[PDB]
Design an enzyme around this catalytic site. Sequence first.
Site, PDB file in Angstrom:
ATOM      1  N   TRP A 291       0.857  -1.182   0.000  1.00  0.00           N
ATOM      2  CA  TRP A 291       0.000   0.000   0.000  1.00  0.00           C
ATOM      3  C   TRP A 291       0.893   1.231   0.000  1.00  0.00           C
ATOM      4  O   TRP A 291       1.609   1.485   0.973  1.00  0.00           O
ATOM      5  CB  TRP A 291      -0.890  -0.025   1.240  1.00  0.00           C
ATOM      6  CG  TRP A 291      -1.758   1.194   1.438  1.00  0.00           C
ATOM      7  CD1 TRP A 291      -1.851   2.311   0.644  1.00  0.00           C
ATOM      8  CD2 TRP A 291      -2.654   1.410   2.535  1.00  0.00           C
ATOM      9  NE1 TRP A 291      -2.772   3.206   1.183  1.00  0.00           N
ATOM     10  CE2 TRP A 291      -3.269   2.670   2.345  1.00  0.00           C
ATOM     11  CE3 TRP A 291      -2.996   0.651   3.660  1.00  0.00           C
ATOM     12  CZ2 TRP A 291      -4.210   3.188   3.249  1.00  0.00           C
ATOM     13  CZ3 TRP A 291      -3.937   1.168   4.556  1.00  0.00           C
ATOM     14  CH2 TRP A 291      -4.533   2.419   4.337  1.00  0.00           C
ATOM     15  N   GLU A 292       0.856   1.987  -1.099  1.00  0.00           N
ATOM     16  CA  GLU A 292       1.651   3.200  -1.282  1.00  0.00           C
ATOM     17  C   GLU A 292       0.708   4.415  -1.354  1.00  0.00           C
ATOM     18  O   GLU A 292       0.187   4.740  -2.419  1.00  0.00           O
ATOM     19  CB  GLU A 292       2.516   3.057  -2.548  1.00  0.00           C
ATOM     20  CG  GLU A 292       3.475   1.844  -2.501  1.00  0.00           C
ATOM     21  CD  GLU A 292       4.385   1.718  -3.728  1.00  0.00           C
ATOM     22  OE1 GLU A 292       4.702   2.739  -4.357  1.00  0.00           O
ATOM     23  OE2 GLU A 292       4.816   0.587  -4.046  1.00  0.00           O
TER      24      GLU A 292
END
Length: 540
Positions: A291-292
């Site tokens: 998750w960026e």
Amino acid sequence: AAPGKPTIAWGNTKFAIVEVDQAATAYNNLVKVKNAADVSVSWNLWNGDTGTTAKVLLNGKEAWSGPSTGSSGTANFKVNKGGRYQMQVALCNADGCTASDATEIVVADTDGSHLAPLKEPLLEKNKPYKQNSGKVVGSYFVEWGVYGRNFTVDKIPAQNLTHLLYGFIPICGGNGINDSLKEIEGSFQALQRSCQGREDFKVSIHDPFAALQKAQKGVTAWDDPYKGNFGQLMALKQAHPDLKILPSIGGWTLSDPFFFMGDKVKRDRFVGSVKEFLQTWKFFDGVDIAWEFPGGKGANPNLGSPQDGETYVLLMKELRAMLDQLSVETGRKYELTSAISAGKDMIDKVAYNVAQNSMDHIFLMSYDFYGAADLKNLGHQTALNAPAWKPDTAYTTVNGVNALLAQGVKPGKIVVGTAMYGRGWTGVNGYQNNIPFTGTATGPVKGTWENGIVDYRQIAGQFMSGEWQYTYDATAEAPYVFKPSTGDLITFDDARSVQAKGKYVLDKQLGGLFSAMIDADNGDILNSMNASLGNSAGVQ
Ligand SMILES: CC(=O)N[C@@H]1[C@@H](O)[C@H](O[C@@H]2O[C@H](CO)[C@@H](O)[C@H](O)[C@H]2NC(C)=O)[C@@H](CO)O[C@@H]1O
Ligand SMILES: *[C@@H]1O[C@H](CO)[C@@H](O)[C@H](O)[C@H]1NC(C)=O
């Protein structure tokens, strides 16, 4: 007298527990998980009495029995375990049983139990290492690397890894959910086609052709059910049963859906879809969450919330609970990992001292610290420390590690990142004291595939001769090349800076090293990751 010896009829001998629909683009239709493969066999009897009972044997064990009613027959039955079987038809009467010669049948399943091991020679400069340090040696392989890059699973130097991460598994969703994909021509539409009829927030496969259908070494026969990256990864698992192969959900352009998971309705749907994905694709060993990034500052400037840190911790705990249940159902160990930003500001948006209790490994993205997105502030993109000309440099590997340790993260959880590529600029000018980083640039360096990014293979192959200067900064632990006539400046990892990272990992008792992306190495980087962590040369 006993019956005559039956002859097995010519016919299909290749069957599948997980069926693949060869004329489908939607993931819901592409894959059909069954409890068992539907197998069929026929026979003819050319000489003798047909007997009174016909049986189908697999490795001598009856899978089907019925009355023998004439000179030909057909049996349909189920086989619930993948592999290869010596199948016979036997005709029996009161005077004895007479068995045909054996015909091999193949029952496919997504553990690769039907596949020969994919055990390919090391290519380029890769040298063999044993995985005996006890440290993580990981790398990501990208789904689309099989196109222009021509880098397929049979090219992975798999004996030199403990963890192979597959980038990237998308989360279904259209407008407002995967808007970041719209920046890549065709990519948003490709996901909508894969996800047709499938609920938002369930996982899918972004490119089913690359993942499952493109012919590749070892999976080229038309009726091989699993081809592409997944088929080769199954065969790779057969060659390397101790290799951990993890699907990575997210990445830069597929992370938008995570920002909605504060709604537990969506988060529960996602976690359940991950379980189903792992039950479907048995060669995978857990899940990596890329998750960026919690809080935003990734691809989408309109996403990010102060709630994201709590959502991340809840997501890790619920994923772990799902994997623990999957583990005891299967008898297998499953891993949960996550790739995270290495900036202190980003790290402090999440309570990793809590989340670490759910996670086997934290992949610290200690790279991309600098690059062509900023033409005024130049620096080392993946250095261990700050350079001598700017000791207060914020984005370094050590500062990211230290931020995690300060929260209370145990050091053994932390896997330090190395880069198999350089980032760089063109037209660098106005620098002082023969340090190009003190100048400013006019644009990105010309890339191998994408602007401002150069495969390490190309740095070594093209930019270590001619006019290019080479310098190893021993304070930062970082090499760089510079072409003065054009102002091209490239920052990257080399064998020495990787060695400095490996020694740092051993000294600080960290978890190991990992890289992106495996296709861009010529062998120098992964060789050094292995050597510097203390892995012995040779084969296991
Ligand atoms: C570690 C990290 O967060 N790096 C960022 C880069 O990932 C960003 O570049 C983007 O990289 C992805 C692949 O990871 C590409 O798909 C994407 O096209 C690319 N975007 C741009 C604009 O280059 C980078 C963007 O400023 O920010 C960090 O370095
Ligand atoms: C980064 O951008 C490239 C170029 O469009 C694309 O091929 C790739 O899918 C992107 N990577 C990620 C992880 O989103």
